[PDB]
Structures are given as C-alpha cells and as structure tokens.
C-alpha cells in the first residue's frame, strides 16, 4: 500500500502507451537480463557518459516485460521506481524518516520476487538522511533487486569514495553510438514528431542531421544530439506554417523602426533610406504573391539554417547573397589594402575554397604567415578581413605574443592545473574560442616569443584541437590563425628564408600554407594611400561641418617629401600631421575658422598654408 | 494557488504599461519563440557578457505576448517568475524546504501549461542544501515545467559546467553586444521616459 | 551583526530578507550606508547564495547604498564578481596638497582643546 | 515531541603556488 | 540651459574618469595660447624642442589627435646636464597643479630578461598573482598621467618587446586578462646616446 | 581559545561579538592586550574584521606585540590595519644595560636555587 | 649504420636495450612505393565529394605528374599531400561555385606541364 503512495510505476504507463519505443540496444538489455536473474548478487547498475541514453534502456526492459520476449524467470513483475523526494516531505519529527524507511522494506519483503526496484540516481542515497543506511542487511539477504543507473565521474566520486556497498553492485559499461546506427534510431522515432506538429520529414533531413552534427556541434553525445535539430527544425517550420512568413517580417520591422525614429525627428538621410527599403519590401512582397500564384516539409536547408543560426558556423548552400560578396571580394578587400595583389589572390583563396565544402575536414581553415620589412600592412591586412567577415573590425580575439618571451608565461592562454590560485579565471585563449568559434585569431611578432610555446602550436594546426588545464578539448577547425613576421628584413627572397629556416624548426614550416612575403611600396602606389589618409582626415573631422579643398598639385607635393623604401608608409602619416595639423590646430582655437566652412589648402615652397 | 505565495507576476505588471519599452532585437525574440515551444527539453538559457541586455529579453517577451504577435499556442501564458531566496525562508527543519519545493512543482504541473517560469540568475540553482536542487532534475527533461534563465557568461562555467548532468537539459542561446548603429536606435527610443521622471 | 548566530539552515537568509523589506516598504525615506562593503562578497558560506540575493534589487534602484572601500581591497573582491561590478558607480576621492590640508587642520582645532585642557 | 533541525556547515582548503628559479644559461 | 545638450554630456564624462575632454570654453584657451612662453620659467633655452611638445597639447585638445594612438610619444636625448628630466617634470606642472602624480618608472635596472613581470604581472597558479603589475595598476585608476621612461639604453632588449605594443596600439594585458588602454597619455622617452655626436 | 568549537556559520563571530559588547559595555577601563596579533589578520573559515571599525574610533586600548620579521609579511600586505597602529620601535640594548639587568634578576633564581 | 647505433646506444640509461628486441630502419619515399599514397589520398578526396554526388576519373600520366614535385624524400610525402588540394582544389573551388558543374556530373583530369586545367 505503501509503495502505491510515495513510488511510482513503470507498468502502469508502459500499458498505456506512454513511452517512446527503444529499437536498438539489444546487448546491453540481454546483459541486464541475464545478470538479473542470477541466483545471487543481482544488482545492476549502468554506468556511462550523459545522453547516451539509460532511462530509455529500463523503458525498453519494461516494453519487453509487458509484450513478454524475456527469458524465463521474468513473467509478470511490475517493475517499481522509488520516489526519494516524497521520502522526506513533511518528517519533522525524530524518529519517523527511518520508520517510513522501515515500512516500505517491510512493504517490499512480503512479495517473493515480483517487484524490481529500480531506483534512478542512486548517488543521492549516500546522504539524504541527515539514514539511507538501512540497505546493507537488505542486500546481505538478497531481498532487494535495486537496478540503478548513474553517470561517469559522479559514480567514483562518493561510491567508490564509500566502498563499503560497492561490493554488493556488478557494473556494466554503457556504450555511446556512431554516426552508424543513430540513422537508424532516427527513422524509428519519426512517426511520433509528424503527430506532434503539422509537419512531414523527408529522409533527406535524417541523413544531413545525423552527419552535420558531428563536425560542427562537439559538446554533446550522438542519440540525443540528432534529436535536437529536427524536433527544432520542426518548430521553425511550424513558426513559418503561419499566415506570414519571415524575412517580409524583418523588412517590415525594420522599416516600421525607421519610420518611428524618422517621425520623431520630425534627419533626411533615414527618409532615403526608408524609401530604399520600401522598394525592397514591394518587390519582395509582390514576388511573394507571384510564388503563391505558382513548402510544407522539412528539407536539407532547415537542418543548415538551425546549425548555421545556432553556434554562430556559417554552413547552408550558399544562399545567393553572398556570391555576390565572394566574386566582388577581392575588389571590397582592396578598399583598405593597396597594392600586394599576389597577396590578398592568396587569402581570398582560403576562404572560397572552405565555404564551398571542399576543404579539409580536420585542419584550421587558414593557417599562413606572412612577413616582410614594416609599413607594408601586414597588421592593416587582418583588420581589413575581419571588416567584412564580422561587419565590424573590434570583433577580432587578437594575442600578443611580444610578451611571451619565456618558458613559464604558456599558463596565461591554457589556463593553470587545477588546485592552484587561478582555476576560478582560466585561460585567455581556451576559454575565447569555446564560446563560439568563429573568430579570427592573430599573432603579433611570432619571432621574439620563447621557443617552446611552438611546441604548443604543433597540435593547434595539423590535429584540429587542444587540451587545457581544465579538462576539455576545444577545437579550432573553422578559424582562421594568422602570424605576423619581420624576418630577415634585407634578403631579396631567399635570405629570408634562410632566417626563417634557421629561427623556426623545419617541422613547423611543413604544416603551413603558403608563407606570403610582401613586396613594399610604389611612387605611383602612393598617392591612393594618400588620398586615403585626406578622407579619413576629413571624415573624423565631420563632426563640425570642416571639409576641406586640396589641390592637385598639394596633393602631389605629399608624395614627394617623404619617401624612402625604408620606413614604408608610416612616415608619410606623420608627415601630414606635420603639414597639416600645426597650422590647423593652432588656428581652429584661434577663432576664425568656424563651423560651416570649406577651408583650402594651397602650395608654398616649404610648408602649405591656410 | 501556492504560487501566489512565493512569487512575482510579471504579466500582471506589464498589463498596466509599468516596464520600459524594448526596441530592437527581432533574432532573440524569434529565436526564444521557437526553443520554447518544441516538444521535450524546452527551456532556453540567455548567456551573454552582462549588461548587454538579457532581463530586457524577457520583459520584450511578456509584451509581446500581453500584445499578441506571438504564434497559436503560445497565446496567454502568464510568465509567473519565481524566487529561491524567499521560498528558503523559514527552512530550519529537516524536511520543510524540500516539502515546499515539491508544492510549488506540484502546482505547476497541476496546470496545463499554461505557466512560463522564469528563474533569474539560475546559477544559485545548484545549492540551498545543507540532494536539494537535484529533484527538479527528472521534471526538466520530460518537459512539464517551462523555464526561461539568464546567466553572466563566466558565472555559468563555474557554477553549473561543474555539474554536466544538469547542463544537458538547457539550450545555450548567445547573446551579443551591439554596435553604435544599433544604440542610437535604443537612445531614441528611450528618450521619453526620462524626459518624464525629470522634467527636463 | 545579522550573520550573528545564524547556525540553522533557513536562520540568515529571513533575516536579511526582513531587513530588506522593511527597507522597500517605507516610502523611499531611508538611504542605507554599508561601510567596508568587500563584506558583501562571502556572506553566507554554504554554492553562491547570499550576497547576490540582493543583486535585483539594485538595478531597480530601491536602496541608496552608499559605501567605502579602499583601491586595493577592490580588484581583489568585486571585480573578481564583475555582475556586481555594474551596478555600482564610483566616485574616485584623491589626496589633497598641503595648500588645503592646512586648511583642514585649522578647523578641526576645537575638539583637541577640549579633550586636552590646552 | 522534539525536532531535528538540520544544521549547516563551512568548508575550507587553500591553494599552492609554484615559483620557476630562472638559469642564467653561459 | 532648459534642456541637456552636447556640451554637459563631455563635463559627465570629464569630472567622471578625470579626462579633460571639453571644448575649451573661454577660459583655458587662454592657457594654452601661452604654453610655448609659460613653459619658460622653468626651462631656459631649448626652443626647437619646447615648440613641439607643446603641439602634441594643442593638437589633442583641439580634437585632430589620432583616435587610437597614444597622444604624444617621443623621444628626446643628448648630453647630460641639459634639462632633458626638468622638462618632463615641468609639462607635468601645469596639467596637474603638482609634480608628484605622474608614473615615474627607472629602466636603468633591468638588465636582464625577466623584469619584465614586475611591470606586466605574473601568469596564474604563480607565487605573487594578485598583484597586478607596476606599470599597469597605477594607469587603471586615472587613466591620464604622464609616464616617463629613464635611460631607457640599459634595458636589455626584450623590454624593447613589451613596449612595442604599448605604442601604436595603446594596450597591453596582464595576469588577470583585461587590456588597459593608453589611448591618451604622453609618453616620454630619455636618453645619453651618442653624447656630443656632430 | 575563541575558535575552540566552530564548525558551523556564524559561530565565531556571536563569541566575538559578546567580548566587544562586554569591553564597550563597561566604561573606560577595560584595557586590552593581544599578545602576538599577527593572528588577527586570517581566522576567517571575513574575520578579524569587526575590529576595524572600533579600532579608529577609540574604544578598545589594545596594547600590541609583534615580532618584525612576522609584522611585514601578515599585517603590512594588508594595509587597511596598518594606519591604525603605532609602531613603538624597541631596539636591543648595550652591555651597561644588561650588566644592570642582570644585577636585578641575581635575586629571582637564588630562591630558585640554593647557590 | 655506425652512427645511428652509436647515437642510439648512447641515449639508453640503464637498461633500454637487451629488454627490448631488434632495432629496424627506414624505408623512406621510393618510386614503385609511391603510386598507391595517391591512390589513398585519391580516394580520401572522392570521400570528400561524394556527398553532392561527384566524383572522379584519374589517368596515370597525371598521377605520374604530380610525382615530379612528390618525391624529395628529406621532408617527406607532406608538400604532396598540400598540392593535391593546391592544384586541383583551387580550380574546383572556383568552378563549383558559380553553378555549371551541376549535381550528377563527373570530373576528369586533364594533364598540364605545369597546371591541370578541366
Ligand atoms: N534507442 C533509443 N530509442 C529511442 N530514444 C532513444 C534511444 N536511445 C536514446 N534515446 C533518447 O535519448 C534520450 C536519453 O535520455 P535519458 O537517458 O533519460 O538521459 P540520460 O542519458 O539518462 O542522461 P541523464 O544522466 O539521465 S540526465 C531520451 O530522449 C531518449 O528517448
Ligand atoms: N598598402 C597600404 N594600403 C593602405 N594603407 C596602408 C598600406 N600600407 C600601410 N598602410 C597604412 O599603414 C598603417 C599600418 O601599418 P602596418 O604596415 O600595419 O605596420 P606593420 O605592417 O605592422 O609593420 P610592423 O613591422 O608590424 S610595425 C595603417 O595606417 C595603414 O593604413
Ligand atoms: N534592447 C533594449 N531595449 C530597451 N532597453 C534596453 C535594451 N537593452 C538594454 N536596455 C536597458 O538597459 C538596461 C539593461 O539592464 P539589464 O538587461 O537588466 O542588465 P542585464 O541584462 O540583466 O545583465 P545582468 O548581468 O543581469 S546586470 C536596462 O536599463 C534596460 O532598460
Ligand atoms: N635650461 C635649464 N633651465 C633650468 N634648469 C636647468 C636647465 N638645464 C639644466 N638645469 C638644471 O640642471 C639640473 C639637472 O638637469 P637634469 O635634466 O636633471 O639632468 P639631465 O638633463 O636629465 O641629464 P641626465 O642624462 O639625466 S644626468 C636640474 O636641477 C635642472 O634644473
């Protein structure tokens, strides 16, 4: 009676329906079964990494117990699960937790060997009492069946810390799935998501979802894993089955917004802009309706919008956007680059390679240094791809290794051993990366760092992944790594890599691509830095209505004076500020030169005037 | 009826115009729409350096809904937000927390689902022991209880990645810091309601 | 004086809960002052539970809480915990010269003859 | 007729620290 | 004076972080027409090297400076007994009505290659870990001192290193992982080269 | 004697806080004396910590002794408690000193001893 | 054989060598041994493009063309591994995704002295 009121029961709602059917796993039902039925020592327990599945293991017991393909001894059972949360409820008193106990083994000792007890999470029995010892007289008569299930690490952590029951349990090991067989636990859990929603699912969706989920999404374990992205997939459509669909959403929102601010105002500016995506919206809209006048199903494109839109990994089939940006790239990239034409057909050619799913599985993206004399723009080169891979170019993780220059500072990015001060903190690059890997990482002066933290770069490229001082496995496989040089910085071509050879081991070398080196400058490469640097000039003093007129010949007599092929494009930065900024910021705060003006430049034989 | 006695109502105060307007942000909103509305496991957690906006999330969520732009059967939910530190009142005893835990979930389940919970700062979630905190474990994952959190980003890998058993029954949903564009489009909208509280 | 005694399970957390309200349920009259308030931090040693249980009640602005800390007990306690970090402002009080310490120490000439008859 | 009244605890264990003892290498 | 304008935002986020970002309204535009003839009651001579630091002010409070790089960071050397430290004690005078608050380092003592981390930190799980650095907790707290660098030939070069990033970048990291920006401090270098090259 | 039995919250600091209260209870003459304080500073488990108030405000006298080797690496790492003490230096003394000592205590160990 | 027995011996402290067995040497990257790495990497690649259904034909005189710059047995077969996704990858990756090399279709190999145009 007893049993009725504070446990459940498994039998109950297995003949009604109530589960989810468990094709698969017949090894590990068969070993439960049979290590069951011995005469003595019968008490399982499953033991195995979280998510692989072992509720569903004793659910599939109990479907087998109602339908009857058991061996011998195992007619009619009614397997029961204890409640150890209505155990204490209410027991403020002294001697009641320990005689509510006692009144349930006395419930469980009267029938010979029909109930299987079966309690889930047993590593909770340990304390919960101030009790939860009266087990050991129990288990010493073999009244008890008490099948049990806990996880990896949590086992040996109090258990076999408290050795004295463990004696009384045989284990068996549970095994995760592969990409194998988890296709075929997913066709057997179709019928069920269909009824939930209103949505069908292709067979298609079961292959992609089951093999995408393994390159990309490595936090988890496969069988619940696969289950995400379709019963998510599944909502997504569902959220579209509606009257209106998306993207119009996003338009009319977003117009809606700029409506609402513009009123406010009332910028100009907004009201083109509005008009803009007001033509956008119509053409969008009437297309709608032409395709209506012309989905009901998940595809391959839903499991890539779910796995693209989660964990920030660009991964669909190229939605017709960007092969607008990846054919115009390389002119968008030289906006802030001039010049080093063989360099940027190299680094644009890393990325169309691995967006178009051709690229290697298990390698870094990108993985090439580049190097040269200074005032090139090897440093300008990744915040100028990161402007346009982000939209915004303080979205780059960037390290310096100038300061590494020793052998105990490598704690710094892989974070200290447990038990020490800093294991709250962790690493600096570890722990970057892991939440949402992506981003594109730099190494400023690669030359001045110790030669023993390549000994920790060697397993970043050419594996994929790392270790820490934690215990997880971070991966790198769709980054782009980035090291900076000044090597050699005389040799023609081939004095630099004789530096290079003789710095770096032969064995690092080996895993790189192409080792860019760069080239310099150009007179006539020069004027468009120049006119580069006057508009930036005047967009950062646009904030006062302060535009200026330079003249042709002005701006030629800034190529001139400041040169040489030694210092690159950096003395010619200062060197406008030299000009310009004297005179400028000594009259702007003089009066006179208030807003709303255009203010010339004009040449005079040394300096150029106001 | 218990949870009147242990909890805010968030639908109750957003039903008299009392919080303050969020603008922006479609892809969360989208985004915590379709995680908490699948069949098992839907609870969603907002992760994000702090104060780039997380409680805003929910409190658009609620006027979104007390709205109704919100699909079918999402329609009249009431988020009802709940607490641990004040259900851990009066707990001397050795069994008085555990039985009230187990009427709050009670009267959660006894309904149809009609109740969003909404635990703020769930990293508190793990303690209040001495086991407790470890019998909501079997409801998450069967789906019952709807649960919406928010953590700061580096609380969560201290807290609750220490206990892997829990952290398989949520959904990370990253939440990231905006650009100047966007902010100008949040100063413009903010702008009447301290033009109201100071009279400037 | 509130983690006083407070051996048994639930016997702070009501505690600070039922100075709390009475601080919300006046009509805005009191302002607190929390002197040395790196005492936050670890308050209740069970696990993180208290300390930041006061935590949403401060974005709301419902008690004033002025405080003192010093620079250097700061960036080991607070900004190790950097949600707390973000609710506070800080006003930073440098030293003064000896042009203005002068002028202090003249005022502060009264007590000193009383105390000492001199 | 008495109760039980389930008392709390605190729990303390400090961390190490090593130091690396530079050579100076001729 | 009926509404908030752009100008009372700037005193908020002067008086708040001590930075002096204004417009120079009306009464300090008077100090620094003078700046070039003030500085001259303290140091005698040296015109060509008083008219340019005296730029790097007036340039950076006009709102011309460059918006990531420190606001002046240049070097001046020589012979000895010149004015070369009474100048960069002199231009601390007037920006901070004192002598004493600016961060005054000496690298005349590291000669070896593992001074660095009094300056940058120690990594974690290390014997001296919540300390910061010298040179990183003092900027912090005001972000607008001046910093010297004194004899700056004795360092052994890899210091040369850590200083690299300070200019051109204006951040560097330590131990506790936050990157402390010098987006607006003078930087000044000193120096005995040469002594009495033609 | 005062962290004699504590495992528990809060039991250290109700047994301290009854001393404070039975020194401030009475009036002024209750002068106290820690013998070797550089104990103070930990004892936690944040304790060590109600003093700090009292002790710049004149209440409790609290005449001190520390050694100088143990003073600068537990007290002035902590430089909160370090401006509310004087430092009373005590250097070691010259011979003439000791030979006038050692000529007071001549009468101490002849009762000690029969010689 | 002298030197490498001499460097090996030396680096055993006590111990290392009577308690193993035979030491074996190398044999490194040679002509007749080389055609079946490409016939592994050849088909790790078509693993690689069977899921869009593509797939290859090689001819030997293009597999004897790349093993000009696939031999240099000092650094090892690695460069090879490299240009078998630098030449052929780069035309590919520019083919695929401007359409025209639609879904069904198959590649052939086409020799070049110094590329391999399709
Ligand atoms: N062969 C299978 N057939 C159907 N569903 C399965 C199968 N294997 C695993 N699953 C599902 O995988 C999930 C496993 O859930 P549980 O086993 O209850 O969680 P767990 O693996 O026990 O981890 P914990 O520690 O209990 S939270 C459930 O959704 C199961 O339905
Ligand atoms: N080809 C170029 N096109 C446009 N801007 C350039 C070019 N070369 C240099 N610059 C400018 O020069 C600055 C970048 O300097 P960098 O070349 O990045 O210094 P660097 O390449 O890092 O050399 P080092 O040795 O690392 S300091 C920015 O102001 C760029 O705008
Ligand atoms: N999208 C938004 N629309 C309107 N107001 C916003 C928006 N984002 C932020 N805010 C405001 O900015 C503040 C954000 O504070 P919170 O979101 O409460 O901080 P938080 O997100 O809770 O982060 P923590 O770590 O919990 S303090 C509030 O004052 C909001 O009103
Ligand atoms: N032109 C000057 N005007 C005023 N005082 C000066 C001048 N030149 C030197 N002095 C004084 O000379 C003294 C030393 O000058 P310092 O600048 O301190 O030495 P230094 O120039 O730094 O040379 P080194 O390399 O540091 S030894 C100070 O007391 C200065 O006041």
């Given at each position: 009676?007893?049993?009725?009121?504070?446990?459940?029961?498994?039998?109950?709602?297995?003949?009604?329906?109530?589960?989810?059917?468990?094709?698969?796993?017949?090894?590990?039902?068969?070993?439960?079964?049979?290590?069951?039925?011995?005469?003595?020592?019968?008490?399982?327990?499953?033991?195995?990494?979280?998510?692989?599945?072992?509720?569903?293991?004793?659910?599939?017991?109990?479907?087998?117990?109602?339908?009857?393909?058991?061996?011998?001894?195992?007619?009619?059972?009614?397997?029961?699960?204890?409640?150890?949360?209505?155990?204490?409820?209410?027991?403020?008193?002294?001697?009641?937790?320990?005689?509510?106990?006692?009144?349930?083994?006395?419930?469980?000792?009267?029938?010979?060997?029909?109930?299987?007890?079966?309690?889930?999470?047993?590593?909770?029995?340990?304390?919960?009492?101030?009790?939860?010892?009266?087990?050991?007289?129990?288990?010493?008569?073999?009244?008890?069946?008490?099948?049990?299930?806990?996880?990896?690490?949590?086992?040996?952590?109090?258990?076999?810390?408290?050795?004295?029951?463990?004696?009384?349990?045989?284990?068996?090991?549970?095994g995760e799935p592969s990409v194998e067989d988890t296709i075929g636990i997913?066709?057997?859990?179709?019928?069920?998501?269909?009824?939930?929603?209103?949505?069908?699912?292709?067979?298609?969706?079961?292959?992609?979802?089951?093999?995408?989920?393994?390159?990309?999404?490595?936090?988890?374990?496969?069988?619940?894993?696969?289950?995400?992205?379709?019963?998510?997939?599944?909502?997504?459509?569902?959220?579209?089955?509606?009257?209106?669909?998306?993207?119009?959403?996003?338009?009319?929102?977003?117009?809606?917004?700029?409506?609402?601010?513009?009123?406010?105002?009332?910028?100009?500016?907004?009201?083109?802009?509005?008009?803009?995506?007001?033509?956008?919206?119509?053409?969008?809209?009437?297309?709608?309706?032409?395709?209506?006048?012309?989905?009901?199903?998940?595809?391959?494109?839903?499991?890539?919008?779910?796995?693209?839109?989660?964990?920030?990994?660009?991964?669909?089939?190229?939605?017709?956007?960007?092969?607008?940006?990846?054919?115009?790239?390389?002119?968008?990239?030289?906006?802030?680059?001039?010049?080093?034409?063989?360099?940027?057909?190299?680094?644009?050619?890393?990325?169309?390679?691995?967006?178009?799913?051709?690229?290697?599985?298990?390698?870094?993206?990108?993985?090439?240094?580049?190097?040269?004399?200074?005032?090139?723009?090897?440093?300008?080169?990744?915040?100028?791809?990161?402007?346009?891979?982000?939209?915004?170019?303080?979205?780059?993780?960037?390290?310096?290794?100038?300061?590494?220059?020793?052998?105990?500072?490598?704690?710094?990015?892989?974070?200290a051993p447990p038990g020490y001060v800093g294991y709250e903190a962790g690493?600096?690059?570890?722990?970057?990366?892991?939440?949402?890997?992506?981003?594109?990482?730099?190494?400023?002066?690669?030359?001045?760092?110790?030669?023993?933290?390549?000994?920790?770069?060697?397993?970043?490229?050419?594996?994929?992944?790392?270790?820490?001082?934690?215990?997880?496995?971070?991966?790198?496989?769709?980054?782009?790594?980035?090291?900076?040089?000044?090597?050699?910085?005389?040799?023609?071509?081939?004095?630099?890599?004789?530096?290079?050879?003789?710095?770096?081991?032969?064995?690092?070398?080996?895993?790189?691509?192409?080792?860019?080196?760069?080239?310099?400058?150009?007179?006539?490469?020069?004027?468009?830095?120049?006119?580069?640097?006057?508009?930036?000039?005047?967009?950062?003093?646009?904030?006062?209505?302060?535009?200026?007129?330079?003249?042709?010949?002005?701006?030629?007599?800034?190529?001139?004076?400041?040169?040489?092929?030694?210092?690159?494009?950096?003395?010619?930065?200062?060197?406008?500020?030299?000009?310009?900024?004297?005179?400028?910021?000594?009259?702007?705060?003089?009066?006179?030169?208030?807003?709303?003006?255009?203010?010339?430049?004009?040449?005079?034989?040394?300096?150029?005037?106001? | 009826?218990?949870?009147?006695?242990?909890?805010?109502?968030?639908?109750?105060?957003?039903?008299?115009?009392?919080?303050?307007?969020?603008?922006?942000?479609?892809?969360?909103?989208?985004?915590?729409?379709?995680?908490?509305?699948?069949?098992?496991?839907?609870?969603?957690?907002?992760?994000?350096?702090?104060?780039?906006?997380?409680?805003?999330?929910?409190?658009?969520?609620?006027?979104?809904?007390?709205?109704?732009?919100?699909?079918?059967?999402?329609?009249?939910?009431?988020?009802?937000?709940?607490?641990?530190?004040?259900?851990?009142?009066?707990?001397?005893?050795?069994?008085?927390?555990?039985?009230?835990?187990?009427?709050?979930?009670?009267?959660?389940?006894?309904?149809?689902?009609?109740?969003?919970?909404?635990?703020?700062?769930?990293?508190?979630?793990?303690?209040?022991?001495?086991?407790?905190?470890?019998?909501?474990?079997?409801?998450?994952?069967?789906?019952?209880?709807?649960?919406?959190?928010?953590?700061?980003?580096?609380?969560?890998?201290?807290?609750?990645?220490?206990?892997?058993?829990?952290?398989?029954?949520?959904?990370?949903?990253?939440?990231?810091?905006?650009?100047?564009?966007?902010?100008?489009?949040?100063?413009?909208?903010?702008?009447?309601?301290?033009?109201?509280?100071?009279?400037? | 004086?509130?983690?006083?005694?407070?051996?048994?399970?639930?016997?702070?957390?009501?505690?600070?809960?039922?100075?709390?309200?009475?601080?919300?349920?006046?009509?805005?009259?009191?302002?607190?002052?929390?002197?040395?308030?790196?005492?936050?931090?670890?308050?209740?040693?069970?696990?993180?539970?208290?300390?930041?249980?006061?935590?949403?009640?401060?974005?709301?602005?419902?008690?004033?809480?002025?405080?003192?800390?010093?620079?250097?007990?700061?960036?080991?306690?607070?900004?190790?915990?950097?949600?707390?970090?973000?609710?506070?402002?800080?006003?930073?009080?440098?030293?003064?010269?000896?042009?203005?310490?002068?002028?202090?120490?003249?005022?502060?000439?009264?007590?000193?003859?009383?105390?000492?008859?001199? | 007729?008495?109760?039980?009244?389930?008392?709390?605890?605190?729990?303390?264990?400090?961390?190490?620290?090593?130091?690396?003892?530079?050579?100076?290498?001729?």
């Amino acid at each position: 009676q007893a049993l009725q009121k504070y446990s459940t029961d498994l039998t109950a709602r297995a003949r009604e329906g109530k589960l989810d059917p468990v094709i698969g796993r017949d090894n590990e039902i068969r070993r439960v079964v049979q290590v069951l039925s011995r005469r003595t020592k019968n008490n399982p327990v499953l033991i195995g990494e979280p998510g692989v599945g072992k509720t569903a293991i004793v659910e599939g017991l109990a479907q087998r117990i109602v339908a009857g393909d058991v061996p011998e001894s195992l007619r009619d059972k009614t397997i029961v699960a204890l409640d150890l949360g209505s155990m204490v409820a209410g027991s403020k008193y002294r001697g009641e937790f320990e005689e509510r106990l006692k009144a349930v083994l006395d419930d469980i000792k009267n029938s010979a060997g029909q109930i299987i007890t079966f309690i889930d999470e047993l590593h909770t029995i340990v304390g919960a009492g101030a009790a939860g010892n009266m087990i050991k007289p129990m288990l010493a008569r073999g009244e008890l069946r008490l099948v049990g299930a806990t996880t990896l690490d949590e086992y040996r952590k109090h258990i076999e810390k408290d050795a004295a029951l463990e004696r009384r349990f045989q284990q068996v090991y549970v095994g995760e799935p592969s990409v194998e067989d988890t296709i075929g636990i997913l066709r057997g859990l179709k019928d069920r998501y269909e009824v939930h929603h209103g949505v069908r699912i292709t067979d298609s969706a079961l292959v992609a979802a089951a093999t995408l989920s393994d390159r990309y999404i490595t936090a988890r374990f496969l069988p619940d894993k696969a289950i995400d992205l379709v019963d998510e997939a599944a909502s997504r459509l569902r959220m579209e089955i509606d009257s209106r669909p998306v993207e119009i959403d996003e338009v009319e929102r977003l117009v809606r917004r700029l409506e609402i601010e513009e009123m406010a105002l009332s910028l100009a500016k907004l009201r083109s802009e509005l008009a803009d995506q007001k033509e956008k919206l119509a053409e969008l809209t009437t297309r709608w309706q032409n395709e209506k006048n012309a989905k009901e199903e998940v595809g391959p494109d839903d499991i890539a919008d779910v796995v693209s839109a989660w964990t920030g990994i660009p991964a669909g089939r190229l939605l017709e956007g960007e092969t607008a940006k990846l054919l115009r790239m390389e002119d968008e990239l030289g906006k802030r680059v001039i010049g080093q034409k063989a360099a940027v057909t190299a680094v644009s050619d890393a990325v169309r390679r691995s967006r178009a799913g051709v690229s290697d599985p298990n390698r870094p993206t990108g993985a090439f240094m580049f190097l040269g004399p200074t005032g090139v723009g090897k440093t300008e080169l990744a915040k100028a791809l990161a402007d346009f891979l982000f939209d915004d170019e303080r979205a780059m993780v960037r390290i310096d290794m100038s300061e590494y220059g020793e052998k105990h500072t490598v704690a710094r990015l892989i974070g200290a051993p447990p038990g020490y001060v800093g294991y709250e903190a962790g690493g600096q690059l570890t722990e970057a990366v892991r939440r949402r890997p992506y981003t594109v990482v730099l190494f400023d002066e690669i030359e001045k760092a110790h030669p023993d933290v390549f000994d920790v770069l060697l397993q970043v490229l050419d594996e994929g992944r790392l270790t820490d001082g934690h215990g997880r496995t971070v991966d790198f496989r769709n980054t782009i790594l980035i090291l900076t040089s000044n090597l050699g910085s005389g040799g023609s071509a081939e004095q630099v890599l004789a530096a290079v050879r003789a710095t770096f081991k032969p064995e690092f070398i080996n895993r790189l691509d192409d080792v860019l080196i760069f080239e310099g400058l150009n007179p006539e490469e020069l004027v468009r830095i120049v006119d580069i640097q006057l508009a930036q000039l005047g967009k950062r003093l646009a904030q006062r209505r302060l535009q200026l007129q330079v003249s042709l010949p002005a701006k030629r007599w800034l190529a001139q004076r400041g040169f040489d092929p030694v210092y690159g494009a950096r003395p010619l930065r200062r060197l406008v500020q030299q000009a310009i900024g004297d005179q400028l910021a000594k009259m702007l705060l003089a009066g006179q030169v208030h807003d709303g003006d255009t203010v010339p430049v004009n040449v005079s034989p040394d300096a150029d005037s106001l | 009826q218990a949870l009147q006695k242990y909890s805010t109502d968030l639908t109750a105060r957003a039903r008299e115009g009392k919080l303050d307007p969020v603008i922006g942000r479609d892809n969360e909103i989208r985004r915590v729409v379709q995680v908490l509305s699948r069949r098992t496991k839907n609870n969603p957690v907002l992760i994000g350096e702090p104060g780039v906006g997380k409680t805003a999330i929910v409190e658009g969520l609620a006027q979104r809904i007390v709205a109704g732009d919100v699909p079918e059967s999402l329609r009249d939910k009431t988020i009802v937000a709940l607490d641990l530190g004040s259900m851990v009142a009066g707990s001397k005893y050795r069994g008085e927390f555990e039985e009230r835990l187990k009427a709050v979930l009670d009267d959660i389940k006894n309904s149809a689902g009609q109740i969003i919970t909404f635990i703020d700062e769930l990293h508190t979630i793990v303690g209040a022991g001495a086991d407790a905190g470890n019998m909501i474990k079997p409801m998450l994952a069967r789906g019952e209880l709807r649960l919406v959190g928010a953590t700061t980003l580096d609380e969560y890998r201290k807290h609750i990645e220490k206990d892997a058993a829990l952290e398989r029954r949520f959904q990370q949903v990253y939440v990231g810091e905006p650009s100047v564009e966007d902010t100008i489009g949040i100063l413009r909208g903010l702008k009447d309601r301290y033009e109201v509280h100071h009279g400037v | 004086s509130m983690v006083a005694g407070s051996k048994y399970r639930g016997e702070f957390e009501e505690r600070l809960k039922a100075v709390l309200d009475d601080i919300k349920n006046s009509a805005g009259q009191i302002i607190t002052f929390i002197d040395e308030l790196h005492t936050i931090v670890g308050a209740g040693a069970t696990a993180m539970d208290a300390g930041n249980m006061i935590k949403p009640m401060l974005a709301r602005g419902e008690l004033r809480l002025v405080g003192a800390t010093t620079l250097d007990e700061y960036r080991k306690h607070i900004e190790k915990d950097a949600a707390l970090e973000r609710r506070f402002q800080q006003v930073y009080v440098g030293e003064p010269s000896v042009e203005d310490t002068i002028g202090i120490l003249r005022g502060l000439k009264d007590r000193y003859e009383v105390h000492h008859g001199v | 007729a008495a109760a039980a009244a389930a008392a709390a605890a605190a729990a303390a264990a400090a961390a190490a620290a090593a130091a690396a003892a530079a050579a100076a290498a001729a």
